């Protein structure tokens, strides 16, 4: 009955918000990630790192506020408040981009905290930890997109900024520079996400429309008792309906619910792998056989060549403003343009 | 099971399955070394990152 | 002196169908990139 | 089209090798 | 007989008091003219 | 050869649909 | 500075007002 | 020689130790008072 | 000729596409919203050029 | 266009001519499919976490369920007790019918909006 | 069951609750309001006021271009503003 | 029966057959190394270490042999360009052969341990069950690792008894294998100080020897034995996978950023040398010095070595490749033959103009020429109707200094334009595109492929750690939860501490 | 040497397809006993 055993008893006391040992990592970091985002989007500029306004105080709205990435000249600096760039000056820290690494790093450890919480709670209640295992895909996405991707590039500047419109800019950057829609790892991610939404909707609708009449009411929600032993819908009727509608159907409820875990989790993992490749500019940008043909045959045109022309427009029209540290000066005459527009 | 000459020579090395020091044993000492290791790794990371800049240490190819 | 740790392995027909579908769709996906 | 000539064998083995694996496991499940 | 100050009490207040401060700050912003 | 490969793989998938539907392990109520 | 104290004064007042209204019940929080 | 960033390094080290120190000090104290009852 | 400007876009595997780049191409902008069944075309060759399969599908 | 690259062309031109990323109905569609994928993983992992022991470790746990059986193969009370503690008690469903209606409704409504 | 805290429905319908929070809430609202109206928020965070984005005749953004001189670059920009 | 994804768990209680499986994996890995090296030797062109080094040729294991001292072939060439050398047995061919032989002996050992699985050494004296004393094994293995680590730093790296390692100048011009003295000071931790690598292995080896001695002699405390499930071999797999993905992330990092162990003469430049114009500056420094000593433009640029100019070219930047653009860099831009010389652009007014260089982000990039002040002065226009800066309007010419074109000047717009299109890539080189049917599209270097593969593997092994970590800790409920789990245990208000049945009411 | 490119896939299938047929037949025999 040492102090460790006593601290363990209090941490694991059953209260309204469970704490646990994992809480000591989780709660400070999550609160500070949250808090830093709300603080930066309300009060802090991106004027000296990006040449942009980015806070409510500057007149942005919920879609255009952001905690933006540090200037490219910071490289991959941790940007510690007490470090060589800000030298303990909080104001300068905000101006140089320190809230971005602040949120990214506290957020990283908060995510670790949350996964640890899933393990800790599962162990105490006596359930298998498949929910912790499922949470590895969001962690893979976050680590690959916010950390690995900028670490392979020139600086933190090219990571996603934390904001709605800033993430849309990120989307479009990845189209015009990486041809990311053409990447089979993203295609697998897309299939996993849309397949997960498909399964979500089809399983809920199927259960809602094969319920047993276990009550007299027209609202069927009151006819379920969480301690009842009986299945609340008919697996047998659901199976026959889908076999005759679609040709096949689930027959094993365990495989069904495992499959629901597997599909979106695997999708996010695949997309994470493609982003790691993009950290190094290892894109699936081109098809060589199409380029060889197209270069030789001015009559050969496909949707592949049409999209490259869009990518080229994106790159040249957005780069000067998007990468102000490069000092791109593009005269009008060099900008690619079709007729009239 | 099958006895061999080499087996007999090695036998004592695989004979204490399950034997433990009582209670917490050397756990306090392990914690100290872990925390020393953390600070150490932190120094190495921050030198590489140029968050920690030491006299005479130029983290560049020109070293 | 048989080894007691040996086990039979199984793959039911549905798993065969699932697995054949995975391999074929993956092939159909990546073949364009293998040909380049 | 000037495609990679090794693309055919890569695709063919990519299909055949894992497929044959699954067939082997399935047929011996059925006969036992 | 319930406690007034709990872990839960700290939890809701670590969120709620900054939120209201922030809303009043954001309200005042609507009147800044350039 | 690449056209033939794409069409072959697609055709194998359609054959798999046929067996997966009409020659499934029948679901048994037991 | 003066701005630091006008931003803090309603917070101090709001904190004092709540402590005076719950002080008997918070002291009864005992052991 | 102590550089400015080495002085910052130590400031971060000490700040981290104090923040962690107050945390476990408060927690061990609360846990010793608000004890779980077994019978 | 998807855009109606006599600039045909190649969409099929036999004409130099792969799985990722191929498509059934939308019908010509010259047609607009007009109905273009096979029997409105002077020939199948006309129908193919102007993207008749897309409407039918 | 009826094609993989053709779809992407359609999306890119759509963005240039309508700023669809900045349209709330598309933002609702993303919440719909992201959230759909999230809740798919959650429901799958929660039911899988609380499967009742019915098999040994040398066989698939899927054989713990028999097609047509009357009893449930997982302990929803255990899943609630886990998930209630991961967040807080009332952020968690204990009514399987309410839970499954939520699974149907969320992605459907979101895809309605983006359509 | 219940984990032993006071039910929320009880607290927010209680008179003592609204007595306490009729004051704390608007005081915090006013404190936030004052934080911006005093101009203190600009100076804490270094956010430009509408007149301090550019000098009067410059059209170039004051982008920081040096990692370790950065704090100094920003200060030099802020003084070309006077 | 077992599902297909569990077949290998028959080894969990079978230490002999576990050893056999581990032997076979080891035989497979050593076999790959020797096979890979033979393939690289059969295809490597040693004739030009200046413009056709190993890293332009897709060589992957060749640089790892060269790094630790293997530099010559039995046919008498060395990768440093020396001829008529006798490397003894430890040539590239001897290393490959030695791994093939080692693979074959491991294959045989695996067969013996598979057949004779029931050795008394593997059974616990008390209980008669298969048992492995994992705490003691860790101490023994840690002790061995420390000895090897010490010996490698003390004898191989120092040259006391061994060859040393690859060291070069800061610009990758003069690398070779040299003994390295340890750097014991704070600069030992500078990843670009090779002496730090020696010092690391000596110090870390001694620590491992001592720690191994501790772990052989001191039992684990009961608290840690229980918490970490030290009687379960899967706990070791879980922690071992964690240390392995940690290591994979570090070597991905040091390969991408550069360190003393990833030299540019073996793996190629980093993308950061392009970003900071690391080579262009040094080139300009030498040119400035020569012009100071009264050399002419031609003399100053002719003094620049080709090897150095070749580094200042974006086709050697590893961030310029593509995921499915396969093979050696020579398959893309061609086999480099010769520096064409440094191109100098001038307008009709005689002012010198500078082509803006392509950043690595861009698959394509316009041609824009600025003056020393960064003012646009010439470009290649897209729309011609209102161009102000065409080469034709501005009278742009190109003159070459050094290299093959030294002293030549071109004035016709079409020719000036094509040289300006190459100058966005950096220095201009003559390429042989026909020998390998090169397609003209940039590929990444071994530095790029290494970094990609290990970052990907590291991320995947994180999932392996989570998976086996959970199976260790939740072993008791791996097949399902308790079929008579009490509702009191899982819903609220009955137990004062979650889980603990001894905290009723 | 300028050898027939299809020679490689011809050789691989010639080896693989009949070999795999035999293995399939062998393994399902062993699992009968
Ligand atoms: C899954 C589980 C998830 C768990 C969550 C993890 C949360 C933990 C927190 C993560 C810590 C990240 C900080 C890493 C910072 C970093 O790397 O910062 C980068 C620095 C290197 O600094 C960079 O170095 C570059 C190379 O410069 C070199 O080259 C130049 C020549 O041009 C000059 O000579 C210069 O002096 C010389 O240093 C440039 O200078 C950059 O601007 C500068 O930022 O490395 C260093 O700090 C350290 C390098 C050692 C590698 C450390 C491994 C971490 C990275 C692994 C991924 C890398 C691979 C990703 C794919 C690519
Ligand atoms: C779980 C809580 C937690 C965690 C993990 C972090 C983690 C982090 N914070 Mg955050 N922080 C926290 C709480 C936390 N913080 C709190 C509560 C506050 C409010 C005060 C802050 C305020 C804050 C700011 C303002 C900043 C950070 C920053 C950072 C980063 C750098 C930290 C650093 O260098 O530490 C260094 C210190 C240590 C590692 C502690 C050392 C521990 C001792 C000394 C070990 C000694 C060994 C000893 C011999 C062994 C003893 C054995 C034992 C038995 C006693 C890192 C991402 C920085 C950041 O995000 O920059 C981008 C930054 O600027 N934090
Ligand atoms: C005189 C003594 C001496 C000297 C001069 C050195 C010198 C060195 N040591 Mg050694 N060392 C010594 C004693 C010594 N050592 C002793 C006694 C020990 C204890 C046994 C060690 C243990 C040790 C370890 C464990 C490591 C070194 C490393 C190094 C190198 C550091 C430079 C570098 O590239 O780091 C680069 C490494 C880092 C900057 C640390 C990486 C930290 C990362 C960020 C951890 C987080 C990863 C995370 C899980 C995933 C990230 C996700 C996403 C962000 C990607 C250098 C050769 C490092 C090395 O081998 O590098 C090649 C290393 O990892 N040393
Ligand atoms: C018998 C001795 C022996 C010797 C002398 C060599 C020598 C060589 N091998 Mg071979 N090899 C061997 C056995 C051997 N090998 C075996 C048994 C295998 C099968 C596993 C291989 C598989 C193999 C492959 C796959 C490859 C080589 C390669 C090479 C070359 C480069 C080696 C290198 O970079 O290692 C670098 C090794 C490391 C950096 C390992 C670092 C150890 C980490 C840090 C572990 C840390 C954990 C540790 C327990 C912690 C200690 C704590 C500390 C306090 C002490 C070199 C000629 C390469 C080559 O060129 O092949 C042609 C190559 O790619 N080898
Ligand atoms: C760490 C491993 C590694 C690394 C970094 C390299 C790196 C390199 N090798 Mg070596 N090689 C390796 C392993 C490795 N090799 C192995 C194991 C073999 C034996 C097969 C070889 C055999 C080999 C040969 C024969 C040749 C090379 C060559 C090369 C070079 C060009 C590689 C290239 O074009 O890649 C191309 C890479 C790809 C196209 C990526 C493939 C990944 C795809 C996407 C498959 C993954 C999809 C997966 C199914 C997803 C499933 C989803 C599911 C989980 C749901 C480069 C230096 C070439 C060279 O120039 O040598 C002179 C060369 O000719 N290598
Ligand atoms: C040192 C590494 C290591 C080792 C020894 C093991 C060992 C084991 N794992 Mg773990 N695992 C690892 C890494 C490792 N794993 C990693 C990195 C991951 C993340 C991807 C996993 C994820 C994982 C899961 C999800 C599961 C296991 C399971 C198992 C057990 C059964 C495996 C089996 O029968 O496969 C049989 C596999 C096959 C018959 C074919 C698989 C073919 C794959 C898909 C592609 C082949 C790649 C090819 C051979 C190239 C070699 C890879 C190399 C380049 C790295 C076994 C104890 C299982 C378990 O717990 O059982 C109780 C289980 O369910 N593992
Ligand atoms: C710079 C140092 C700053 C120190 C400030 C603290 C910072 C560290 C973070 C602490 C986070 C946890 C705070 C918990 C406060 C609390 O309610 O307990 C502290 C006590 C006990 O509450 C008790 O609360 C208990 C319910 S529960 O455990 O909180 O769920 C209940 O068992 C008991 O009857 C009741 O009296 O309550 C009071 O303080 C009343 C005044
Ligand atoms: C059902 C759908 C779920 C949506 C939820 C809506 C809840 C509504 C619900 O269904 O129940 C409503 C519930 C009822 O409260 P009481 O039982 O106190 O009130 C009795 C009433 O039911 C009588 O009307 O109120 C709360 O729980 C409010 C929650 C605020 C809790 C704030 C706590 C702050 C938590 C901080 C973050 C927690 C940690 C997270 C992990 C890090
Ligand atoms: C960063 C930092 C820090 C921290 C901080 C913090 C912690 C903060 C927090 C903050 C906060 C915590 C804030 C909050 C805010 C909030 C808000 C701002 C909210 C809002 C909301 C809204 C507006 C909503 C509404 C709505 C809608 C819209 C719809 C429906 C209805 C409703 C009502 C829901 C420190 C100190 C360390 C220092 C350093 C740095
Ligand atoms: C017996 C004997 C002998 C012999 C030996 C030999 C002859 C060996 C060989 C061996 C070898 C020769 C081996 C090899 C191996 C290899 C390997 C092991 C490989 C693997 C691979 C892999 C695994 C890959 C994968 C992949 C792919 C395929 C694709 C891409 C991706 C990846 C990379 C993942 C001697 C006389 C010496 C001695 C006596 C006895
Ligand atoms: C820095 C301070 C943070 C302290 C680190 C907290 C780590 C807690 C990990 C234990 C979580 C429980 C996982 C195993 C279990 O289920 O018991
Ligand atoms: C000489 C450099 C200037 C120093 C000025 C002092 C600035 C220090 C700010 C203190 C913030 C401490 C927060 C870090 C605590 C969290 C670290 C951890 O928990 O691991
Ligand atoms: C099974 C034994 C494997 C041994 C591999 C021997 C290596 C032979 C290499 C011959 C390659 C010739 C160059 C062709 C590359 C194009
Ligand atoms: Fe369900």
| Residue H21: other Cβ atoms inside 10 A | 11
Give me the half-sphere count of Cα atoms (radius 13 Å) on the Cβ side of residue L382. 15
Provide the residue count of chain K: 82
Rounded to whole angstroms, how far apart are CA atoms L342 and L302? 9
Q: To 10 degrees, what angle do helices A98-125 and L446-473 make? A: 30
L381: left (phi over 0), alpha (psi -120 to 50) or beta: beta
Q: Using a CB-CB distance cutoff of 8 angstroms, which residues of chain C are in contact with residue F26?
A: none
b/e sequence M1-33, b meaning 16+ C-beta within 10 Å: eeeeeeeebeeeeeeeeeebeeebeeebeebee
DSSP assignment of L184-218: -SGGGGSTT-HHHHHHHHHHHHHHHHHHHHHHHHS
The answer to whether the CB of L443 falls within 8 A of the CB of L325 is yes
Q: Which ligand is nearest to the CA of L257?
A: 1
Whether the CB-CB separation of L209 and L147 falls below 8 Å is answered with yes
Q: Are L106 and L96 in contact (CB under 8 A)?
A: no
Determine the Cα–Cα distance for residues L201 and L194; give it in Å rounded to an integer: 12
B56 belongs to a structural domain? no
B51 has a chain H CB within 8 A of its CB: yes
Assess J19–A contact: CB distance below 8 Å, yes or no: no
L342 in Cβ contact with L304 (< 8 Å): yes
- How many angstroms from the chain centroid is the CA of residue L98? 24
Euclidean distance between CA atoms L487 and L50, whole angstroms: 75
State the distance from the centre of ligand 6 to the C-alpha of M16, rounded, in angstroms.
26
Of A316, A323, A307, nearest to A337 (Cα)? A316
User: What technique was this entry resolved by?
Assistant: X-ray
For residues L268 and L328, the answer to whether their CB atoms sit within 8 Å is no
Q: Cα dist. A46→A54, A315, E7, F12 in Å?
A: 6, 22, 37, 55
Minimum-distance CB partner of A287 among I10, I21, I23: I21
- Breaks in chain F after residues (C–N exceeding 2.5 Å): none
CB atoms within 10 A of CB L75: 10
Q: How far apart are CA A284 and CA I20, in angstroms?
A: 12
Instruction: Compute the distance between CA of residue A56 and CA of residue A45 in angstroms, rounded to an integer.
Output: 9
Give chain F positions within 8 Å (CB) of C35: 2, 5
User: Considering only CA atoms, which residue is closest to atom 4 of ligand 10?
Assistant: L104
- CA atoms of J84 and L330, how far apart (whole Å): 60
In order of A134, C27, J55, J57, L233, the CA distances from L9 in angstroms are 23, 30, 17, 10, 11
CB L328 within 8 A of CB L58: yes
Helix (H, G, I), strand (E, B) or coil at L376: strand
**Is residue L22 a contact partner of residue L113, using CB atoms and an 8 Å limit?**
no
Contact predicate H39/A10, CB 8 Å: no
Strand partners for L346: L352, L397
Beta strand pairing call for L2-3 and C9-10: parallel
DSSP state of E5: S
H helix and E strand count, chain L:
16, 10
Domains defined along chain J, listed by start: 24-115 (1.20.85.10)
Q: Whole-angstrom Cα distance, residue L433 to residue L143?
A: 54
Which residues in chain G are contacts of K20 at CB distance < 8 A?
A: 17-18, 21-22
Which subunits sit against A, judged by 3+ Cβ pairs under 8 A?
A: B, C, D, E, F, H, I, J, K, L
Integer CA distances (angstroms), A70 to A76, A93, A95, J65, L426, in order: 9, 10, 9, 54, 29
CA distance A316 to L381: 13
Distance (Å, whole) CA H19 – CA A295:
64
- Phi/psi region, residue L85 (left: phi>0; alpha: psi -120 to 50; beta: rest), is beta
Q: Is J93 annotated as a binding residue?
A: yes
Rounded distance, CA B54 to CA B56, Å? 6
DSSP letter at L77? B
Q: How far is L236 from chain J (nearest CA, A)?
A: 20
For residue I51, list its beta bridge partners: none
Q: Please state the length of chain F.
A: 30
**What is the number of alpha carbons within 13 Å of residue L302 lying toward its C-beta?**
9
Q: Which helix (H) or strand (E) holds A162?
A: strand A162-163
Q: What is the C-alpha separation between L10 and L130, in angstroms, rounded?
A: 13
DSSP 8-state symbol, L2: E
L174: helix, strand or coil: coil
By the 8 A CB rule, do L370 and L354 touch?
Answer: yes
**Residues in CB range of G6: below 8 A, 6 or more apart:** K34, K38
Strands (E), J1-115: 2-3
What is the radius of gyration, based on Cα positions, of chain L? 30
Domain of H37 in residue numbering reads as 1-39
L440, exposed or middle or buried, with CB in 10 Å at 0-12, 13-18, 19+?
middle
Give the Cβ contact number of residue A85 at 10 Å: 29
Residue A15: partners with Cβ closer than 8 Å, 6 or more residues away: E6, E7, E8, K3, K4, K5
**Beta carbons of L439 and L237 less than 8 angstroms apart:** no
Q: Are F24 and C13 in contact (CB under 8 A)?
A: yes
Question: Cα–Cα distance between A317 and A332 in angstroms, integer?
Answer: 10
Among L262, L357, L284, which residue's Cα sits nearest to residue L314?
Answer: L357
Dmax (CA) for chain B in angstroms is 63
| Residues A303-315 as b or e (16 or more Cβ within 10 Å = b) | bbbbbbebbbbbb
The H or E element containing residue K16 is helix K15-37
CB atoms within 10 A of CB I21: 24
C35–I contact, CB cutoff 8 A: yes
Inspect the interface and report whether the beta carbons of G26 and E4 lie closer than 8 Å: yes
Query: Cβ of H13 and B52 within 8 Å?
Result: no
Calpha distance A152→L270 (Å, rounded):
11
* Residue M19 and residue D19 in contact, taking contact as beta carbons nearer than 8 Å: no
The rounded distance, in Å, linking the Cα atoms of L237 and L225 is: 16
How far does residue L9's CA lie from ligand 6's centre (Å)?
10
The residue among A120, L246, L370, L480 whose CA lies nearest residue J51 is L480
CB–CB contact B54 H3 (8 Å): yes
Q: Is C19:C27 a contact under the CB 8 Å cutoff? A: no
Q: Which two tokens stand for residue K32?
A: 């936030």
For residue L330, give the nearest of L214, L435, L178 by alpha carbon: L435
- 3-state secondary structure at position C5: coil
Helix (H) or strand (E) holding B30: helix B27-49
Q: Please, what is the Cα angle at L457 between L452 and L462, to 5 degrees?
A: 135
- A45 CA to chain E: closest CA distance, Å? 15
Question: Are residues L465 and L471 in contact, defined by beta-carbon separation less than 8 angstroms?
Answer: no
Query: Where do we find the tokens 């602040």?
Result: A102
Inter-axis angle of helices L15-43 and L92-115, to 10 degrees? Answer: 160
Cα atoms in the 13 Å half-sphere on the side-chain side of A90: 7
Q: Residues, chain E, total?
A: 34
Q: Is J72 within any annotated ligand binding site?
A: no
> Measuring CA to CA, which residue among A189, A200, A212 is closest to residue A256?
A200
Q: Return the structure tokens found at J115.
A: 């359509």
| Cβ-based neighbours of L393, under 8 Å, separated by 6 or more | L387
- Ordered domains of chain K (ranges, CATH): 8-80 (1.20.5.860)
Residues 6+ apart with CB under 8 A from M19: none
Where exactly are the structural domains of chain A?
1-341
Return d(Cα L122, Cα L134) in angstroms, integer: 12
User: Cα–Cα distance between A225 and J94 in angstroms, integer?
Assistant: 9
Query: Which residue in this structure is represented by tokens 């608290």?
Result: L223
Contact L26, L56 (CB under 8 A): no
**CA angle at J95 for the pair J91 and J96, rounded to the nearest 5°:** 110
Domain count, chain B: 1
Q: What is the DSSP letter of L232?
A: -
Task: Measure the CA–CA gap between A197 and J40, rounded to whole angstroms.
Answer: 7
Q: What is the 3-state secondary structure (H, E, C) of L391-417?
A: HHHHCCEEEEECCCCCCCEECCHHHHH
C9–L118: do the CB atoms touch at under 8 Å?
no
- The verdict on residue B22 lying in a domain is yes
**Length of chain D measured in residues:** 32
Cα gap L431→L415, rounded to integer Å: 17
Q: How far apart are the first and last CA of chain F?
A: 49
Rounded-to-integer distance, Cα E32 and Cα J48, Å: 54
* Tally of domains within chain H: 1
Rg (CA), chain H: 17
**H/E element holding L353?**
strand L352-355
Helix (H, G, I), strand (E, B) or coil at I37: coil
Structure tokens at I39: 């029997």
Helix (H) or strand (E) holding L336: strand L335-346
Q: Which residue range(s) make up the domain with B10? A: 1-51
DSSP assignment string, L25-58: HHHHHHHHHHHHHHHHHHH---S-TTTS-GGGTT
**Cα(K33)–Cα(L384) distance, rounded to whole angstroms?**
57
Which bin fits L268, alpha (ψ -120 to 50), beta or left (φ > 0)?
Answer: left
Q: Where are the alpha helices (DSSP H) in chain A?
A: 3-11, 22-43, 47-50, 90-96, 98-125, 130-134, 136-142, 149-152, 164-178, 184-208, 235-246, 253-279, 288-296, 303-322
Q: Which two tokens stand for residue L87?
A: 């490397």
Resolution value (Å, 1 decimal): 2.0
- Read off φ and ψ for residue K66, nearest 5 degrees: -135, 135
Distance CA A308, CA A286 (A): 9
């Amino acid at each position: 009955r040492g102090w460790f055993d006593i601290l363990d008893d209090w941490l694991k006391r059953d209260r309204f918000v469970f704490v646990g040992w994992s809480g000591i990592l989780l709660f400070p970091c999550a609160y500070l990630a949250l808090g830093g985002w709300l603080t930066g989007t309300t009060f802090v500029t991106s004027w000296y790192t990006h040449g942009l306004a980015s806070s409510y105080l500057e007149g942005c709205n919920f879609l255009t506020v952001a905690v933006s990435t540090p200037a490219n000249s910071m490289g991959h600096s941790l940007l510690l408040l007490w470090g060589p760039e800000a030298q303990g000056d909080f104001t300068r820290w905000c101006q140089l981009g320190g809230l971005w690494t602040f949120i990214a790093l506290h957020g990283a450890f908060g995510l670790i905290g949350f996964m640890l919480r899933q393990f800790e709670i599962a162990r105490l209640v006596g359930v298998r930890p498949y929910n912790a295992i499922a949470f590895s895909a969001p962690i893979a996405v976050f680590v690959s997109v916010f950390l690995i991707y900028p670490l392979g590039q020139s600086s933190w500047f090219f990571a996603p900024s934390f904001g709605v419109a800033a993430i849309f800019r990120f989307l479009l950057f990845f189209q015009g520079f990486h041809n990311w829609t053409l990447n089979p790892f993203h295609m697998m991610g897309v299939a996993g996400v849309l397949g997960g939404a498909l399964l979500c909707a089809i399983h809920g609708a199927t259960v809602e429309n094969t319920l047993f009449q276990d009550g007299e009411g027209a609202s069927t929600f009151r006819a379920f008792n969480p301690t009842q032993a009986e299945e609340t819908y008919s697996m047998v009727t659901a199976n026959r309906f889908w076999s005759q509608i679609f040709g096949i159907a689930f027959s094993n409820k365990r495989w069904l619910h495992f499959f629901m875990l597997f599909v979106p989790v695997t999708g996010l993992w695949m997309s994470a792998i493609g982003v790691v490749g993009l950290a190094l500019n290892l894109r699936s940008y081109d098809f060589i056989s199409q380029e060889i043909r197209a270069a030789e045959d001015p009559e050969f045109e496909t949707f592949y060549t049409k999209n490259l022309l869009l990518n080229e427009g994106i790159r040249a029209w957005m780069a000067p403003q998007d990468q102000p540290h490069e000092n791109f000066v593009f005269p009008e005459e060099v900008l690619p343009r079709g007729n009239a527009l | 099971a099958r006895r061999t000459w080499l087996g007999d020579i090695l036998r004592p090395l695989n004979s204490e399955y399950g034997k433990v020091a009582p209670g917490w044993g050397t756990t306090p000492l392990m914690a100290v070394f872990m925390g020393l290791f953390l600070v150490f790794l932190l120094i190495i990371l921050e030198i590489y990152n140029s968050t920690l800049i030491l006299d005479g240490v130029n983290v560049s190819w020109k070293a | 002196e048989p080894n007691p740790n040996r086990q039979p392995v199984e793959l039911n027909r549905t798993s065969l169908y699932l697995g054949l579908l995975l391999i074929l769709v993956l092939a159909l996906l990546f073949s364009s990139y293998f040909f380049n | 089209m000037e495609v990679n000539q090794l693309g055919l064998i890569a695709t063919a083995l990519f299909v055949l090798v894992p497929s044959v694996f699954l067939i082997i496991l399935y047929v011996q499940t059925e006969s036992q | 007989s319930y406690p007034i100050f709990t872990v839960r009490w700290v939890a809701v207040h670590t969120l709620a008091v900054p939120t209201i401060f922030f809303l009043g700050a954001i309200a005042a912003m609507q009147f800044i003219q350039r | 050869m690449e056209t033939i490969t794409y069409v072959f793989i697609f055709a194998c998938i359609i054959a798999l649909f046929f067996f997966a539907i009409f020659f499934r392990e029948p679901p048994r109520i037991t | 500075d003066w701005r630091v104290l006008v931003v803090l004064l309603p917070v101090l007042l709001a904190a004092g007002w709540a402590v005076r209204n719950i002080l008997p019940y918070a002291v009864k929080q005992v052991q | 020689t102590i550089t400015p960033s080495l002085k910052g390094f130590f400031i971060g080290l000490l700040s981290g130790a104090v923040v962690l120190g107050l945390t476990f000090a408060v927690l061990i104290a609360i846990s010793q008072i608000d004890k779980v009852q077994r019978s | 000729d998807i855009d109606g400007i006599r600039e045909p876009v190649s969409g099929s595997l036999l004409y130099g596409n792969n799985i990722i780049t191929g498509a059934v191409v939308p019908s010509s902008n010259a047609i607009g919203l007009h109905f273009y069944p096979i029997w409105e075309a002077a020939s199948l060759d006309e129908w193919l050029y102007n993207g008749g399969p897309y409407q039918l599908i | 266009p009826l094609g993989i690259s053709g779809t992407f062309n359609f999306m890119i031109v759509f963005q240039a001519e309508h700023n669809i990323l900045m349209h709330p109905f598309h933002q609702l569609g993303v919440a719909g499919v992201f959230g759909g994928a999230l809740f798919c993983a959650m429901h799958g992992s929660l039911v899988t976490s609380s499967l009742i022991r019915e098999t040994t470790e040398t066989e698939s746990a899927n054989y713990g369920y028999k097609f047509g059986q009357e009893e449930e193969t997982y302990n929803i009370v255990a899943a609630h007790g886990y998930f209630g503690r991961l967040i807080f008690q009332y952020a968690s469903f204990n009514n399987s019918r309410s839970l499954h209606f939520f699974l149907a409704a969320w992605p459907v409504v979101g895809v309605w909006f983006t359509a | 069951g219940t984990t032993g805290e006071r039910p929320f429905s009880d607290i927010i319908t209680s008179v003592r609750y609204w007595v306490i929070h009729s004051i704390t809430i608007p005081a915090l609202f006013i404190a936030g309001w004052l934080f911006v109206s005093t101009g203190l928020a600009y100076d804490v965070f270094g956010t430009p006021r509408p007149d301090s984005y550019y000098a009067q005749e410059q059209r170039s953004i004051p982008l920081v271009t040096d990692r370790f001189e950065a704090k100094q670059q920003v200060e030099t920009f802020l003084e070309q503003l006077k | 029966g077992l599902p297909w994804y569990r077949v290998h768990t028959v080894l969990i209680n079978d230490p002999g057959r576990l050893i056999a499986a581990h032997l076979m994996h080891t035989a497979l890995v050593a076999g790959w190394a020797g096979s890979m090296a033979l393939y690289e030797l059969a295809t490597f062109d040693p004739s030009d270490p200046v413009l056709n080094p190993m890293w332009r040729q897709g060589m992957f294991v060749l640089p790892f042999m060269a790094r630790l001292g293997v530099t010559g072939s039995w046919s008498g060439w060395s990768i440093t360009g020396e001829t008529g050398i006798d490397p003894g047995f430890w040539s590239f061919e001897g290393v490959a052969l030695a791994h093939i032989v080692l693979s074959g002996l491991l294959f045989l050992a695996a067969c013996w341990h598979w057949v004779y699985w029931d050795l008394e050494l593997f059974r616990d004296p008390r209980t008669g069950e298969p048992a492995l004393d994992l705490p003691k094994m860790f101490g023994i293995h840690l002790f061995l690792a420390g000895l090897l680590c010490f010996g490698f730093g003390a004898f191989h790296l120092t040259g006391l008894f061994g060859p040393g390692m690859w060291v070069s100048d800061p610009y990758g011009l003069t690398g070779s294998v040299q003994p390295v003295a340890p750097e014991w000071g704070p600069d030992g931790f500078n990843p670009y100080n090779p002496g730090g690598v020696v010092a690391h292995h000596i110090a870390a080896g001694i620590v491992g020897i001592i720690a191994g001695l501790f772990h052989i002699l001191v039992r684990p405390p009961q608290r840690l034995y229980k918490a970490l499930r030290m009687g379960n071999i899967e706990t070791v797999l879980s922690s071992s996978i964690a240390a392995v993905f940690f290591a994979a992330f570090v070597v991905a990092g040091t390969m991408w950023y550069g360190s003393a162990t990833t030299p540019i003469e073996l793996f190629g430049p980093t993308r950061y040398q392009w970003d900071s114009s690391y080579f262009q500056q040094e080139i300009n420094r030498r040119v400035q010095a020569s012009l100071a000593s009264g050399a002419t433009l031609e003399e100053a640029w002719s003094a620049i070595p080709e090897k150095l100019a070749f580094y200042d070219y974006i086709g050697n930047n590893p961030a310029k490749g593509g995921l499915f653009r396969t093979g050696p860099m020579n398959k893309g831009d061609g086999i480099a033959q010769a520096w064409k010389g440094h191109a100098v652009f001038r307008n009709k007014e005689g002012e010198e103009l500078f082509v803006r260089r392509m950043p690595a982000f861009f698959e394509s990039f316009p041609v824009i020429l600025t003056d020393k002040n960064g003012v646009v002065k010439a470009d290649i226009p897209f729309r011609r109707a209102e161009s102000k800066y065409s080469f034709e309007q501005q009278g742009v010419t190109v003159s070459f200094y050094g290299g093959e074109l030294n002293g030549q000047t071109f004035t016709d717009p079409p020719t000036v334009k094509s040289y300006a299109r190459k100058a966005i890539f950096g220095e201009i080189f003559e390429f042989d595109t026909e020998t390998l049917n090169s397609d003209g599209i940039f590929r990444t270097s071994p530095r790029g492929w290494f970094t990609f593969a290990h970052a990907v593997f590291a991320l995947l092994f994180f999932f392996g750690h989570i998976w086996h970590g959970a199976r260790t800790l939740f072993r008791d409920v791996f097949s399902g939860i308790d079929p008579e789990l009490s509702p009191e245990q899982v819903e609220w208000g009955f137990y004062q501490k979650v889980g603990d049945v001894t905290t009723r009411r």
